[PDB]
């Protein structure tokens, strides 16, 4: 009824109007500004959405994926939007501009975006001071089941990938509930992740974040088997499955389908779910998975949960549906959980594998 009306209006009228008036990067920039200022209305989270994972309570399992709030400017407005957790970044050590504009492209016919931002970042030091300003506010949020993740990048020109990520661990690890490293042979991955975990383990017990590895959906079977093996061997805390795809699934209609970059949204959905499914099996259900890629409904959310995800993220659906999508996904997920006989989200995790 009321929520649905709001959802209708945003999906059918407001967002298409606003996206038609703006270039896509301007739209992103304006969203971050509006969100930072809390210019949003406000769905009471039931107990059945609560998840305990990664050393933390999550009030609900629907997170904002990396890339929306690259520089940690809008964290409080994102909780206000109703996300159960927030992931900022990617943040690189040094400030960098990222790629030339235009670098974001809408494929509205496909409910997809292509981006090639190229890790535009304010840098660790700006983001550190920004999180420091609200550090105690975040400690209370985390305690109340609303944790904060930080995705760490590397500078375009850097010689030593591992040292960039290490810098990130040292600077932002003390302010994060979890840290994320994106990965694109096996001995080099082990070397990199060893160094990351060593740095993490050197932070004082109360400032010690979980470390997650975030994979694209474009990896070979050999890459996925090697990642599962290294993740288990090293005691990596979790996996974020997946980033955008450099593939172009047959059937894209948008005029901008041949733009270089990462494809997100609906055409990534089932690629992403199947990657969750394979990573869950290769890790024997022992490594918590955050599912991401084309979530715009409770059904999308539940398919990833049942495939092996403990938590989900979305970004692209926000570009088409606006802020009401968060309440929509949560409400539909709750209803689906009851319809399939699950007492809560926890019971559904990996339910397809059993
Ligand atoms: C991929 C880059 N990218 C694109 C282009 O593909 N769009 N986009 C978003 C834009 C918006 C906008 C724009 C249209 C002004 C407003 N609002 C919003 C709000 F922030 C506060 C109260 C009302 C509204 Cl509608 C959103 O939530 C929102 C979210 C997005 F992800 C975004 O990150
Ligand atoms: C504009 C844009 C910027 C992104 N930036 C980042 C980033 O800096 N780091 C990262 O790990 N993922 C980034 N992502 C990937 C998302 O976090 C997510 O994995 C992907 O978009 C799939 O989810 P979706 O289909 O819900 O958007 C970005 C995605 C988009 C669309
Ligand atoms: O900044 C970007 O280009 C970017 C980073 C990332 O991890 N994923 C993505 O789709 N874009």
UniProtKB/Swiss-Prot annotation:
It catalyses: (S)-dihydroorotate + a quinone = orotate + a quinol. Its EC number is 1.3.5.2. Keywords: Disease variant, Flavoprotein, FMN, Membrane, Mitochondrion, Mitochondrion inner membrane, Oxidoreductase, Pyrimidine biosynthesis, Transit peptide, Transmembrane, Transmembrane helix. One of its GO terms (cellular component) is mitochondrion. Its cofactor is FMN. Residues 4-354 are mitochondrial intermembrane. The uncleaved transit peptide is required for mitochondrial targeting and proper membrane integration. Signal peptide: none annotated. It is found in: Mitochondrion inner membrane. InterPro entries: Aldolase_TIM, DHO_dehydrogenase, Dihydroorotate_DH_2, Dihydroorotate_DH_cat, Dihydroorotate_DH_CS. GO terms for biological process: 'de novo' pyrimidine nucleobase biosynthetic process; 'de novo' UMP biosynthetic process; pyrimidine ribonucleotide biosynthetic process; UDP biosynthetic process. It is linked to Postaxial acrofacial dysostosis: An autosomal recessive syndrome characterized by severe micrognathia, cleft lip and/or palate, hypoplasia or aplasia of the posterior elements of the limbs, coloboma of the eyelids and supernumerary nipples. The identification of DHODH defects as the cause of postaxial acrofacial dysostosis (POADS) was obtained via exome sequencing, demonstrating that this method is a powerful tool for identifying genes underlying rare Mendelian disorders. Exome sequencing consists of targeted resequencing of all protein-coding subsequences, which requires around 5% as much sequencing as a whole human genome. Monomer. Catalyzes the conversion of dihydroorotate to orotate with quinone as electron acceptor. Required for UMP biosynthesis via de novo pathway. This is Dihydroorotate dehydrogenase (quinone), mitochondrial.
């Amino acid at each position: 009824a009321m929520a649905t009306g709001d959802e209708r209006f945003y999906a059918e009228h407001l967002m298409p109007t606003l996206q038609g008036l703006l270039d896509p990067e301007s739209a992103h920039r304006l969203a971050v500004r509006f969100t930072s200022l809390g210019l949003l209305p406000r769905f009471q989270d039931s107990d059945m959405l609560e998840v305990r994972v990664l050393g933390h309570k999550f009030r609900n399992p629907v997170g904002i994926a990396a890339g929306f709030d690259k520089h940690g400017e809008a964290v409080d407005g994102l909780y206000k939007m109703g996300f159960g957790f927030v992931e900022i970044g990617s943040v690189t050590p040094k400030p960098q501009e990222g790629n030339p504009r235009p670098r974001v492209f809408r494929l509205p016919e496909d409910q997809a975006v292509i981006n090639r931002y190229g890790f535009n970042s304010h840098g660790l030091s700006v983001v550190e001071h920004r999180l420091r300003a609200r550090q105690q506010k975040q400690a209370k949020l985390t305690e109340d089941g609303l944790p904060l993740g930080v995705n760490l990048g590397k500078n375009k020109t850097s010689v030593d990938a591992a040292e960039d990520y290490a810098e990130g661990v040292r600077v932002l690890g003390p302010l994060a509930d979890y840290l994320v490293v994106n990965v694109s042979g096996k001995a080099e991955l082990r070397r990199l992740l060893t160094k990351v975990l060593q740095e993490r383990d050197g932070l004082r017990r109360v400032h010690r974040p979980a470390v997650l590895v975030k994979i694209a959906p474009d990896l070979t079977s050999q890459d996925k088997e090697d990642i599962a093996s290294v993740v288990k061997e090293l005691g990596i805390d979790g996996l974020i499955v997946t980033n955008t795809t450099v593939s172009r699934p047959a059937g894209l209609q948008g005029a901008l389908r041949s733009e270089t970059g990462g494809l997100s949204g609906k055409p990534l959905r089932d690629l992403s779910t199947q990657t969750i499914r394979e990573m869950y099996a290769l890790t024997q259900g022992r490594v918590p998975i955050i599912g991401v890629g084309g979530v715009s409904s409770g059904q999308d959310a539940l398919e990833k949960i049942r495939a092996g995800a403990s938590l989900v993220q979305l970004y692209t659906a926000l570009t088409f549906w606006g802020p009401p999508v968060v309440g929509k996904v949560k409400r539909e997920l709750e209803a689906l959980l009851k319809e399939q006989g699950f007492g809560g989200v926890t019971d559904a995790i990996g339910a397809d594998h059993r």
